[PDB]
Amino acid sequence: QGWTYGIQQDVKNRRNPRLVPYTLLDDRTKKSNKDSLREAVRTLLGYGYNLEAPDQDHAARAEVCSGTGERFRIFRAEKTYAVKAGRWYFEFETVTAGDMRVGWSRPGCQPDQELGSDERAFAFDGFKAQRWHQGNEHYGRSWQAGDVVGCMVDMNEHTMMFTLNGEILLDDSGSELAFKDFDVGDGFIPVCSLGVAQVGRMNFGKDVSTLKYFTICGLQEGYEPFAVNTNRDITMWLSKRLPQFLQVPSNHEHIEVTRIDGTIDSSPCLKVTQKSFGSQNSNTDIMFYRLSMPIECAEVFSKRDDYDFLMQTSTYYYSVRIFPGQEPANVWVGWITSDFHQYDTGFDLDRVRTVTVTLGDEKGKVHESIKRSNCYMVCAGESMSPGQGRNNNGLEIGCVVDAASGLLTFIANGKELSTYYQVEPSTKLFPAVFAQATSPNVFQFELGRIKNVMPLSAGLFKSEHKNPVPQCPPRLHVQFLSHVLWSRMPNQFLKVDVSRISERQGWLVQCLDPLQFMSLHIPEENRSVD
C-alpha cells in the first residue's frame, strides 16, 4: 500500500508506527491480536480437530553476524614490553561471559589467528574451560559475567598459572601449572582475544589499588604487576580491522610470485602462481593483487612507431595474461586507488564503491558532473568474446591509461573494449588484478608495450621517463590485500564533551583541547601512518 515505519502516526505521509518486527511490536496490539488468535485456535481445538504442534527443532546461527570474515579482535601490549625474566601479573575482566581468550603471546603472534591455535600464544579459554597452546586441553572452570581472570607468568621456572576470582585453576589432574615447559625466546606480552559481542578489560597494574585479586593471590607469591614501575600508560596494539596491501611473503602458504627477466623477444613479467593448489587445505577465495607503484595523472587535464610521438606522449600501458586453464570469469583486470580496502569473498563490478559529485550553477543547470571510484576494472570473462579455445595466446587484457586526459581504455586480444573510465586529475592509479585461483598458474603481469604507447616504467619512474624500453626494477613488486597487520591504539584521544542542552537547543558537542600527532607519509603508496 505504500506505508512506512515512523516514530509517530501520520496518515498524510502514509507512516504507521506499527510497522515493526513482532518481537518489537507494541504491547497492546500484541496482546489484542495474541488473545484473538489464541481464542480462534483454541475454539478450532474445541471443534474436535486436534492440532498437533510440531516439535521445536533446535537451530543455532553460532551468533556470527560480524563484519565479513572477522570473528575475534586481539588486544596486546607493545612488542617492546616483552618480558624475558621475572614474575609478572595482570588481570582480565570479563564484562560479558562468552568466547574470550587471555594469556601471554610471543612477539610474533599473527593478528588474524586464534589465540593458542599455534605456538605463539598461551591462552585460557574460559568459555569452554580450555587451555590453548597448539591445541585445546581441558583446564580450569568457566567464568561468568563480571569474573576477573588473573594471568601470572614465572619466567625463571618457565611456568604460567591462571586465577579465576582469586582461585587458582587446575588441570584435569590437580596440577596447578597451566603451562610449564617453554623456552624464553623473545619474551611474552599480555594478550586477549574477544569474540563477537564480547567486552573485556585489562588491568596491567599501573595502580596496584585498582587490582582486585592481586593481594588475594599473587602478592605474597612474588609475582609483580606488569606495569608496576612504569611511568606511562602501556601502549596497546590491536588487530587492524581494515585490510591493507603489502608485499607477498616468500613463505606464503599459497601465493608465489615469480619475477621473469625480459628477453630480447619478450617483456618483463611478474608471474603469480599458487603453491598449494589442488592439495587438501587449499584456499579458494578472491585474492586481491596490485602493483606496488602507481601512475599519477596530470595535475591539469588538457582541454616503426614515431620516436617523437613516443617522447611527447603521456600514455602508458601494461598487460595481464590469464593463463590457459584459469577461469576468465574469476579474473578482474584494471586499476585501483589507494582507497581500496574492500576485502569481500565475492567480488563483482557492480558493488564497487562509487559516487557522482554533481556541481551546478546558481540556476541549477549541471555545468559539470564528475564520477568517482576506487576500482576501475573489467572482468576477463565478459571481456573475452570469441570463446572456446583461448590457447592460441593467453588472454591479454591490455590496460591503457592516458595520464594527460584521465581516460582509461582496455584492449583485449587486439580489440578495444567498450568499457572505459574517466578519472579526476592527479589521481594515482595502481595496476591491480583480482583473481580466484582455479589453477596453479593464475595470471601474469607482462610489462610490454603496444604501438605508440609508452611502457609502464616510463610513468612509474622519473629516471625512465623518456626511456621507451620496458623495465621491471626491483622497487616494483606484486602486493596483495591481507589482514595480517597490527594497529596502534593512541595513548590519548580527543576530549569531546557531549550533552543535550534542552529540547529546543539540541545536543551540544564541545571539543577545545588541542591534540596533535606527527604522521609519516609513504610517497610510493599514497598512505600516511603515525
Binding site: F323, P324, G325, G387, S439, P440, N441
Partner: protein, 128 residues
C-alpha cells in the same frame, strides 16, 4: 620407413573411416558415464558457442585447468572402469594364451601412482 606420414592433414580433410578410431574412445567414455545414470547438461554459454562456431601450430594447454573435488572423485572410479576394461581385454588375452599372470592384473587399488598414468591423463583429460 622414413617416419613420414600424410595423416597430419586437418581433421576436416581426414577420411571418414580414419575417424571411427578416435571416437570409439569417446563413445566408450560416453557409455561409461551414461551407464552410471549421470545426466550431462549443456549450458547457455556452450549452446551460444556452438551457435557461433601443414597448419598453423595452435597447441591446447590441457595441463593447467583443474577439476572439482567431487568431479575428481567421480573420475576416480570412472578411470577405475577404464582400467577395468583394460583388464577385460588382457583377460581375453590370458584366455587365449592359456595362463601366465600379468603384473598389473591386480585390482585398481593395488596399482601404484606411476602404474596408474594412462587412466589419469585420459580420464581427467576428457573431464577437463
Amino acid at each position: 620407413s622414413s617416419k613420414v606420414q600424410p595423416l597430419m592433414k586437418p581433421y576436416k580433410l581426414l577420411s571418414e573411416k580414419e575417424k571411427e578410431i578416435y571416437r570409439w574412445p569417446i563413445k566408450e567414455s560416453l557409455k561409461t558415464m551414461l551407464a552410471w545414470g549421470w545426466r550431462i547438461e549443456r549450458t547457455r554459454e556452450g549452446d551460444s558457442m556452438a551457435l557461433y562456431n601443414g597448419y598453423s601450430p595452435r597447441a591446447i594447454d590441457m595441463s593447467n585447468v583443474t577439476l572439482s573435488r567431487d568431479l575428481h572423485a567421480m573420475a576416480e572410479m570412472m578411470a577405475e572402469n577404464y582400467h577395468n576394461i583394460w583388464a577385460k581385454k588382457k583377460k581375453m588375452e590370458l584366455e587365449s594364451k592359456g595362463g601366465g599372470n600379468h603384473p598389473l592384473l591386480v585390482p585398481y587399488d593395488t596399482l601404484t601412482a606411476k602404474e596408474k598414468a594412462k587412466d589419469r591423463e585420459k580420464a581427467q583429460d576428457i573431464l577437463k
